[PDB]
Design a protein around this ligand. Structure first.
Ligand SMILES: Nc1nc2c(ncn2[C@@H]2O[C@H](COP(=O)(O)OP(=O)(O)O)[C@@H](O)[C@H]2O)c(=O)[nH]1
Ligand SMILES: Nc1nc2c(ncn2[C@@H]2O[C@H](COP(=O)(O)OP(=O)(O)O)[C@@H](O)[C@H]2O)c(=O)[nH]1
Lengths: 475, 475
């Protein structure tokens, strides 16, 4: 029976009051990673350590300092411990991860000619990240003080410094670090200031296993290590790092969707889309989602004819609008949608900006063509969800730089996300395709997407960690 | 006796009139590559094929379509053949090579989030590049039609398509291709439209040898091949590619300086610099030269004290001012220099913009600190010339992303060109260093730079090509 200690940037908890008694309730959101880990076979118990990121979170942590036991179905339970970081440190590290710095570092945001220019702001953000990293390590370790053989699962890029600190106190523990975002090319990674580009590698490599969604990110990580750490010896075939006694295995662990996640359309959208084939692009208000280039490509396609009764919905998820790169991205999309309507006709392209996840699934079902043309994406789960719920045999245009292209690229229209001509031709070809060809393609697409569930991904992590821990013990 | 056929974008020829007779003269500029190749031992004769890029070049070409024999010293000669391309095709290919496209592709200019967006303009530029590529191949082959065992030396990025066309007609010939600019990471190279990113590789790989200035570019090239061509088999150790029968060797061939290049200062500059230590940043009007970040770093250093009697000259070489990225780069430097003077005092930082190699060498000699902090640079020969002529024991700040850092990085202050804090600290430390420490460092620096001459680089090319041709013949 494994004793699991899961660390992640957030533990999705819903806070409200009971509709009958009014007593305050806090219970876990279904479909989380912790809820799935607790269901696995070799799991005796599980603790979930995450950050307090709301005012409710701060009360819950202060009022239950060592963690609260939350009941799942089937009589399972998790000890959820929320860390109350320093407010000033937390807010700076949160800015440290946005496109103001670290997001642009791992999601290919800088042109090098004009950006970035690291000042004292980067040195202070890095110092605050260290304090934030120790906050997690001490909490994880204190939560696992009484465990004989704790198993550590460290998720999200915010925790890349945690493995070294865990290994410092627990030399023999299995430590998995999983990064949900891409790893950039060695030349791109070393844009970062020296203390950050090397210090981040020093924090991850003591892990037993480092997991990414895609082979490409594992490859770039290995090249970044070989480039920056001369005493490190990499093996691209075996996917391993040898560094100061640490043996580290790099693993690709693709994720697709959670069945528990898979309603009506947003207000006005159904009537607006009536009588028209509906092109749908969906994604967060993040520059990587590439909705501006999608809109331009839809215009280049419409100039080629055949799109007279076709409209485009740019479904958008508001997130971190306070980041200049995100707001600018919305502004650039709004411009392109304005110019698209100014040439093709009023109400040809529409933007819908909201958090209703049911509205997005409703858009997935209605779509006649799905565009997921990210400039880069750690994986992009929407490109798995959308074909699985779409009952219209919609084609899928998928960027080759999405992590999901390694799994689904053969079953989609794979495109260079920077080439408007190629993307316009894919839009035109996808809509010219007949009903029978689209139906057979969508069946092959759904079959390729179905196996990549949350549970299989968690099983991949545990089995993978178990095997590399056995290996690291022998070597 | 080898029969050499050198191809390059330009053959530097000076046209004017005799000061006594007035008859028009056309003779080769000393120190060119062709003049040095003709001087080697195993060279019986040599033909130099290049583009006509002036009106004098066009009249010279029209009047000698098969080439004009130009006399060198010691009774040697080269057949210089200038190609008269189609003006509309030529002008489009020149734009194809500028930062409007291909320069940004190999010199890391795009942020991916907002640039680039390839339209029909890229498809047409590529078609014109093909026509331009055939112009060179037929000219090279027609110049080598009567040669029994021709040796082909193809220089400059404009000719990356030439090796395949030569190999098409001369299956057994030694073909060297040398690229003077960096090769980007595989993830970055594949920004380009599919027909370009693969078609450029298809044109390069039939070469017997592909040469770069730095190990990093050879590595990135190999990774680009392995990523884009599944039938290609690379060997990172042996530095080779196996593709459709072609055996291709990748070689690093560093170049430093030409002794023939190594006077009066620019007007006003000597008096302006009198009584002050002079920081000197020199480079073309190209965004990669990074003069904007150098000026900001000089300001961060000056805020730390110790620079009260120090001034900095941003020496600039106008080149392709018609390119938006170059003009914007000049504008951004002017802004930074304006704000530097508005904070530290009038006439602290000065820009000197003109094309005069003698003025730049004079600035090299006067400098007390040299900054060559390129965002990226294929090699950067200025970082070799400047310490070799500087008689003031000036320190050298050298960007780690310059190809020259592979040779001189250990002997300079190597910096991350994007970190203003690190670069400011290097400026401060370089100016705080005492006379004796700087003198021993400059002596070691000159000793490391001295062997990398033009002649040694040409010998590297011929010896390297000879060895790879013997290997390719056996296999
Ligand atoms: N909360 C919320 N989630 C959404 C919305 N639209 C889509 N989603 C979900 O967010 C996820 C998108 O993740 P992914 O495509 O990997 O891109 P990410 O933003 O980088 O995680 C999918 O599971 C969607 O079902 C929305 O409006 N609100
Ligand atoms: N024609 C001309 N050449 C210059 C000037 N200033 C410097 N140079 C030379 O141009 C060369 C610079 O090359 P390099 O540093 O490799 O950068 P590149 O411009 O990208 O090739 C050096 O040989 C300098 O001596 C100038 O004002 N005019």
């Amino acid at each position: 029976g494994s004793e699991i200690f899961l660390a992640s940037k957030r533990a999705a908890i819903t806070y409200d009051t009971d509709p009958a008694t009014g007593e305050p309730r806090a219970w876990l959101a279904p479909g989380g990673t912790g809820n799935v880990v607790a269901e696995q076979a070799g799991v005796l118990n599980i603790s979930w350590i995450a950050s307090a990121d709301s005012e409710d979170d701060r009360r819950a942590s202060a009022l239950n300092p060592d963690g609260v036991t939350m009941e799942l179905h089937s009589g399972r339970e998790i000890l959820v411990r929320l860390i109350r970081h320093d407010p000033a440190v937390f807010r700076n590290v949160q800015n440290f991860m946005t496109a103001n710095l670290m997001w642009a570092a791992n999601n290919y945001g800088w042109d090098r000619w004009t950006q970035p220019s690291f000042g004292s702001d980067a040195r202070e953000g890095w110092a605050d990240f260290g304090r934030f990293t120790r906050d997690f390590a001490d909490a994880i370790l204190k939560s696992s003080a009484q465990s004989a053989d704790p198993v550590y699962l460290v998720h999200n890029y915010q925790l890349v410094g945690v493995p070294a600190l865990l290994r410092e106190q627990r030399p023999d523990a299995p430590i998995l670090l999983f990064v949900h975002i891409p790893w950039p090319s060695a030349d791109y990674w070393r844009i970062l200031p020296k203390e950050i580009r090397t210090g981040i590698l020093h924090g991850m490599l003591p892990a037993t296993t480092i997991g990414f969604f895609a082979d490409r990110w594992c490859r770039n990580f290995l090249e970044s290590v070989a480039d920056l750490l001369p005493d490190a010896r990499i093996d691209r075939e075996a996917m391993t790092v040898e560094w100061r006694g640490h043996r580290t295995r790099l693993r690709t662990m693709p994720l697709g969707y959670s069945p528990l996640t898979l309603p009506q359309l947003p207000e006005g959208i159904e009537e607006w889309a009536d009588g028209h084939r509906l092109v749908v692009h969906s994604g967060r208000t993040d520059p990587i989602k590439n909705a501006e280039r999608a809109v331009r490509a839809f215009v280049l396609a419409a100039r080629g004819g055949g799109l007279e009764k076709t409209r485009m919905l740019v479904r958008m998820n508001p997130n971190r609008l306070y980041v200049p790169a995100n707001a600018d991205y919305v502004h650039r999309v709004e411009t392109a949608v304005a110019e698209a309507n100014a040439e093709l006709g009023s109400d040809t392209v529409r933007i819908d900006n909201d958090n209703d996840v049911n509205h997005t699934i409703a858009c997935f079902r209605r779509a006649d063509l799905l565009i997921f043309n990210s400039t880069v994406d750690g994986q992009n789960l929407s490109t798995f969800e959308a074909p699985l719920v779409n009952e219209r045999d919609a084609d899928v245009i998928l960027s080759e730089t999405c992590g999901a292209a390694e799994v689904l690229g053969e079953y989609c229209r794979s495109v260079n996300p920077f080439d408007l001509v190629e993307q316009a031709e894919a839009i035109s070809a996808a809509l010219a395709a007949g009903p029978r060809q689209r139906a057979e393609a969508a069946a092959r697409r759904r079959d390729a997407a179905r196996p990549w569930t949350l549970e299989a991904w968690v099983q991949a992590q545990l089995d993978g960690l178990a095997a590399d821990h056995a290996a690291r013990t022998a070597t």
